[PDB]
């Protein structure tokens, strides 16, 4: 019968590893680097677009950074199509929570549920896992500013600063070197860009090959604002830090 | 509107002795004011020395008996031809009846036989499965006529010892199969006189350790 053609996606190796999860992580390691840095007064999300073409429409484009709700955003690393499936689910989950409790969903709860979906694809169903790693950046009134990451295994962890995708080894060393706890958003913005600039496989880091976003309490009095940076705004912030 | 139930009349009677038990029932089958059959048996030998009758709506009675007979058959298959005791049959019938709690079998069911000590046993059921072991039970159309007579003659109710100032009751004792059949025949002739759905014939099934014997008697046909 059909048994002959089954790859058996949800099984262990002799060493106790999930083949497909490991190979999905290998896939993600070739994706454009994405960095998240959490400051005391906000969060930074920075991501490198995958080898841009000059004729690509840059301003009306969304590849790396997506909005889940008013308080939570994600940086993507891996298959974009896979990520969008998960993002729409995460968006719906946030609205279900709001409908039920009349309160915005706590960040971890959203992260856990999305990570539980990924876990399901590794344990049952016989389907390939989602070749996606997320960096969640969000705020709630319990823990304040939070950074998480999830990967195809469905395992998630919290971070002060973290990188996903390509050159995470090199990127994480640089973040570990220059990061400190009393850091501000504006300093974190500079760190994010400097790290990408050194770890990038491109010749030079330019505005058209980047996506950028911040989550500050920079709005008027005790409320959070999401800023997805425009091309011109990235061009300015790149000059302001002295990279170009 | 379609009414799935009907009343086929008739009446049945079960009496238990010391080492025997009888289950009697008239053979008349009716609908409204018409006679369908003057001889349509409704007391059956179901095997393992158990006799059974489900009086009321005949279609439901036949279905129930048919199902219990089949239950006995499968009890043998599944439990190495073990004999189904009368108490085990009773409980099994409760589950058959209660299984249709929300669309009941419109029947009064009575079974008779011998218990595991060899003593006479009669069990009576309501339409939805409540059952009780008794020495004596009448069921069906003329049950209200027959039953108080049985209380008086079988269980000696309201009978006191002469001269004792109504202080000493008449002592209980088992009846002989001969005395019991007299009570059965007199009960049914009395019921035939005063109840229009009762008559034509009387069929009695007697159960002893030797087996199941039958006896038939004519009843008035008006």
């Amino acid at each position: 019968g059909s048994r002959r053609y089954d790859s058996r996606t949800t099984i262990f190796s002799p060493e106790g590893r999930l083949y497909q999860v490991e190979y999905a992580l290998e896939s993600i390691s070739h994706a454009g680097t994405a960095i998240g840095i959490m400051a005391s007064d906000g969060i930074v999300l920075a991501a490198e677009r995958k080898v841009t073409s000059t004729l690509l429409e840059q301003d009306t484009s969304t590849e790396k950074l997506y909005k889940l709700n008013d308080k939570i955003a994600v940086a993507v690393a891996g298959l974009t199509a896979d990520a969008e499936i998960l993002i729409n689910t995460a968006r719906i989950h946030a609205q279900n929570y709001l409908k039920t409790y009349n309160e915005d969903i706590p960040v971890e709860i959203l992260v856990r549920r999305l990570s539980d979906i990924k876990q399901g694809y590794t344990q049952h169903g016989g389907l390939r896992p989602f070749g996606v790693s997320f960096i969640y950046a969000g705020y709630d009134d319990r823990y304040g500013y939070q950074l998480y990451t999830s990967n195809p295994s469905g395992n998630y962890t919290g971070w002060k600063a973290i990188s996903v995708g390509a050159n995470t080894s090199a990127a994480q060393t640089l973040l570990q070197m220059d990061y400190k706890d009393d850091m501000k958003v504006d300093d974190a913005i500079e760190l994010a860009l400097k790290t990408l600039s050194k770890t990038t496989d491109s010749s030079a880091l330019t505005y058209d090959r980047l996506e950028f976003a911040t989550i500050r309490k920079g709005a008027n009095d005790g409320e959070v604002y999401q800023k997805i940076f425009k091309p011109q705004e990235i061009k300015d912030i790149l000059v302001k830090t002295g990279i170009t | 509107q379609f009414n799935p139930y009907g009343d086929n009349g008739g009446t049945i009677l079960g009496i238990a002795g010391e080492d025997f038990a009888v289950l009697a029932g008239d053979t008349r089958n009716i609908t409204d004011y018409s006679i369908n059959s003057r001889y349509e048996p409704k007391v059956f030998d179901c095997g393992d020395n158990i006799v059974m009758s489900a009086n009321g709506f005949a279609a439901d009675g036949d279905a129930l008996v048919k199902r219990f007979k089949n239950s006995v058959k499968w009890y043998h298959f599944d439990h190495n031809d073990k004999k189904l005791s009368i108490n085990s049959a009773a409980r099994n019938i409760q589950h058959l009846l209660y299984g249709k709690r929300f669309f009941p079998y419109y029947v009064h069911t009575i079974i008779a036989g011998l218990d595991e000590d060899g003593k006479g046993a009669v069990y009576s059921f309501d339409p939805v499965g409540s059952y009780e072991r008794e020495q004596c039970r009448a069921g069906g159309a003329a049950a209200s006529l027959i039953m108080p007579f049985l209380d008086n003659q079988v269980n000696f109710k309201n009978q006191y010892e002469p001269g004792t100032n109504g202080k000493v009751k008449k002592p209980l004792k088992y009846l002989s199969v001969e005395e019991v059949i007299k009570l059965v025949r007199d009960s049914f002739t009395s019921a035939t006189e005063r109840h229009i759905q009762v008559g034509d014939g009387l069929e009695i099934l007697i159960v002893t350790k030797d087996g199941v014997r039958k006896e038939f008697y004519e009843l008035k046909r008006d």
């Binding site: - | 799935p4 139930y5 009907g6 018409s34 003057r38 001889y39 005949a58």
Partner: protein
């Protein structure tokens, strides 16, 4: 839940010494309208059974088809289909009785009253009734509808009990059936003069008589009846 539309009235039958007789008129009523006049309500199954059906005619035609299919199914992988493993009246009846009771238990009955008349392989007479409720009974005489009220009393004068069956000949039995059909024509408003009659004998087999008529009727005394009490003219 149904309501019968086109209906068939009484089916009458009785046992005699060597077999059974069964009869039913050829009418398909539509309420008070005597709509259809060529309706056969006696259906032979093999050469040893006749099923007489009263009530809803659409449900009767359904049963015809079931019986017809039963014969076909029994012949499958059955070298003895026309011998030892042929359909018996008791097999045909129990099948119908199972269906009728299953249908009433689903609250969607076949709105009929059926009499299965036949002769078993061992020569025994078979005559049993079943209706829309799944109720079954057997008797030396069986009748449906008005036949139960008017025919049974007449037929029971001939065969009042089991012991009268061997004493009753086919001539006497048929005479009683034909007489009963006349009485039903006098008194049943949804009856017709034309009827069919079937005899299943253990020796002569199945004899199916069609296009019979009620005859030798008494109507002459009607001319003397004037008014409703006092009127003399």
């Amino acid at each position: 839940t149904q309501q019968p539309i086109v209906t068939g009235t009484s089916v009458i039958s009785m046992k005699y010494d060597n077999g059974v007789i069964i009869a039913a008129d050829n009418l398909g009523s539509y309420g008070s309208l005597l709509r259809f006049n060529g309706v056969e309500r006696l259906i032979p199954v093999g050469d040893n059974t006749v099923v007489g059906i009263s009530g809803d005619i659409s449900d009767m035609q359904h049963i015809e088809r079931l019986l017809k299919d039963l014969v076909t199914e029994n012949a499958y992988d059955n070298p003895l289909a026309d011998a030892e493993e042929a359909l018996e009246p008791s097999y045909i009846f129990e099948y119908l009785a199972t269906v009728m009771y299953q249908r009433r238990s689903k609250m969607n009955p076949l709105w009929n009253a059926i009499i299965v008349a036949g002769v078993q392989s061992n020569g025994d007479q078979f005559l049993r009734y079943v209706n829309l409720l799944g109720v079954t009974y057997s008797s030396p005489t069986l009748a449906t509808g008005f036949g139960a009220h008017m025919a049974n009393p007449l037929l029971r004068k001939v065969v009042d009990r089991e012991s009268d069956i061997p004493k009753t000949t086919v001539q006497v039995a048929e005479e009683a059936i034909v007489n009963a059909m006349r009485v039903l024509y006098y008194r049943d408003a949804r009856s017709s003069r034309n009827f069919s009659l079937a005899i299943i004998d253990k020796n002569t087999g199945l004899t199916f008589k069609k296009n019979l008529q009620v005859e030798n009727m008494k109507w002459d005394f009607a001319k003397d009846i004037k008014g409703y009490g006092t009127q003399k003219i």
